[PDB]
Design a protein around this nucleic acid. Structure first.
Lengths: 91, 82, 94, 106, 78, 90, 97
DNA sequence: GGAAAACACCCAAGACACCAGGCACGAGACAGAAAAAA
DNA sequence: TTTTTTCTGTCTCGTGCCTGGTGTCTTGGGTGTTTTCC
């Protein structure tokens, strides 16, 4: 439990990206391949996608933590994920 | 060809992202659901970005298109032009 | 002065698709508001997207791309097909 | 005989009116010729779909009157139409009947 | 006259949403959130009217303000 | 085009001894462009509503009250008004 | 000679006027609109840079980082209310446990 | 981290198809109104 | 008894023709940015 708070304190003060660059790059290319072939990508576009996806996931985890806190639990569950997404309006 | 690459988003990476959000304990079923959510979000952004590239008769996705597209999804990004 | 509306055309297409069904005045107001709102959305998206490529013209391409950007799913594809059908029909006549 | 552009393209919606509204609605200095035809066709197809589903929903209710209730039913019972018209409130449309499963007694 | 939003009325409003049981303390909370929402929309409609050089708020200002807040309303001349 | 020089001038006005990174400069440029787009678009929308063809100080002022929240907007409105009289008295 | 010096502003009034003219918003633009818009932009940028410099001083730094901009924006009720739907690149998150 | 390849975006010159602009005719849209059905 | 379709008077905005400028398109070259590979 102690190192959980240590990880929270370390990562909430840091600003570098936490998603590894090359798997995310391959993921973006794999997703984009099935819309159009032979697609090129600027590096800045991949970086913008990485930053936006990280910000979105951080916000989703914060709202999910609020939902978990509501049910008198400390562990987040998938039902919290779809609860937050449903209330936030995603389908 | 690329096949089954979403698993490249590792489990410690999801752990670090949850730690940034202040989550103390993590269930084992969170990772697959998180991967699905990330895939849905990426597909939604990439669809609009590739449409913007196709209209301009370009063959490369630029940063401006990705900004414009997230802004069109209500997810405005500062720092990459606009 | 008067105020234009889409009431007659909505009634015409309703009589085309459902000959035995009428429509109340409130539903006419909702349909008019719906058509106006969709018009503003597509026109604004086309105007923006045209401004991105430093172009001065809204053509069929800009409207088509705006339709693909807004309409969600198969609806877009169906709309695009019919729109292309209308354009070539116009192009086939004079 | 000066035939209307709507009759030339086989549409019920006014091509001239959308052309005037595009030209007068401060978007861009000049407007291409095919854009009002395309926009009118898109508006026609969409209003046809909405009115079709609403007439059907009225038909299950054994009514010959389309009311806002039937329009709300038609919009919310179709997945893609609900996606498009997500953030709109239909006046006098009401809410779809939905009761949760565990809300019910045993 | 915030007490004019009476307890059976707010009970009916909760009942349309499918709610089975109502806490006794919730009514003041619903009155507060309704007051906040009405305050925001009324403020925007009032400044729209003041820009329009008018002394009477019309429905168009209300629908405009609501649509500008992402709460588009159909049926009132929009 | 960029707003780099003007942001540098106002930065050295408010903080002569403080520097700024390039990423922060890009962030400032994006912020200024976004705020400009919002205010100008809402002013145009107001001009369209009132059947007007001219954007004057009025519609800009009301757009400023419409977008910016609280005290901020008031001081901004005051600042804009002062600029207008400063323009008028020069 | 310049309109900026006449209005006592550092932002370019001519640039705002040119963007309004070629931005396809309306047919004509009054003389007071670009001056007013430039004044609003200058006041807002001065406010956010002031709060960012204060945050940088509190963090014992001499150069403003996007971390400092994120902290300055998120610690201000009016600014974060204005910028609720904005995610700052390389800004991180606000420390909250 | 290095090292090419090359594909593709940027830029300049010229040409013309196409959209705005001016104006006359009118007939289809809008309101008044008359009647029918529920 | 009232909501609503149809008839009619009326008007104004769409259609049609000519002109005229010019925005868009094409072509040709080149650097440079991104992909590929160790």
């Amino acid at each position: 439990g102690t190192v959980a708070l240590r990880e929270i304190r370390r990562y909430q003060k840091s600003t570098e990206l936490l998603i590894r660059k090359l798997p995310f790059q391959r993921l973006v290319r794999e997703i984009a391949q099935d819309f159009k072939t032979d697609l090129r990508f600027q590096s800045a576009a991949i970086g913008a996608l990485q930053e936006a996806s990280e910000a979105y996931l951080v916000g989703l985890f914060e709202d999910t933590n609020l939902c978990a806190i509501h049910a008198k639990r400390v562990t987040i569950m998938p039902k919290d994920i779809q609860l937050a997404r449903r209330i936030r309006g995603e389908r | 060809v690329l096949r089954d690459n979403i698993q490249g988003i590792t489990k410690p990476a999801i752990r670090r992202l949850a730690r940034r959000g202040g989550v103390k304990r993590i269930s084992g079923l969170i990772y697959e659901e998180t991967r699905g959510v990330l895939k849905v979000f990426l597909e939604n952004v990439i669809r609009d970005a590739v449409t913007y590239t196709e209209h301009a008769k370009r063959k490369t996705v630029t940063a401006m298109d990705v900004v414009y597209a997230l802004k069109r999804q209500g997810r405005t990004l500062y720092g990459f032009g606009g | 002065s008067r105020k234009e509306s889409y009431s007659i055309y909505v009634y015409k297409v309703l009589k085309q698709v459902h000959p035995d069904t009428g429509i109340s005045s409130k539903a006419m107001g909702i349909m008019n508001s719906f058509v106006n709102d969709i018009f503003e959305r597509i026109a604004g998206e086309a105007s923006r997207l045209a401004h991105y490529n430093k172009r001065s013209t809204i053509t069929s391409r800009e409207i088509q791309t705006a339709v693909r950007l807004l309409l969600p799913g198969e609806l877009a594809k169906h709309a695009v097909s019919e729109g292309t059908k209308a354009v070539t029909c116009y192009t086939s006549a004079k | 005989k000066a035939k209307t552009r709507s009759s030339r393209a086989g549409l019920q919606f006014p091509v001239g009116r959308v052309h005037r509204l595009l030209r007068k609605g401060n978007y861009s200095e000049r407007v291409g010729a095919g854009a009002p035809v395309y926009l009118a066709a898109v508006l026609e197809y969409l209003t046809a779909e909405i009115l079709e589903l609403a007439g059907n929903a009225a038909r299950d209710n054994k009514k010959t009157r389309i009311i806002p209730r039937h329009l709300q039913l038609a919009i919310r019972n179709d997945e893609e139409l609900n996606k498009l018209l997500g953030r709109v409130t239909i006046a006098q449309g009401g809410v779809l009947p939905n009761i949760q499963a565990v809300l019910l007694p045993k």
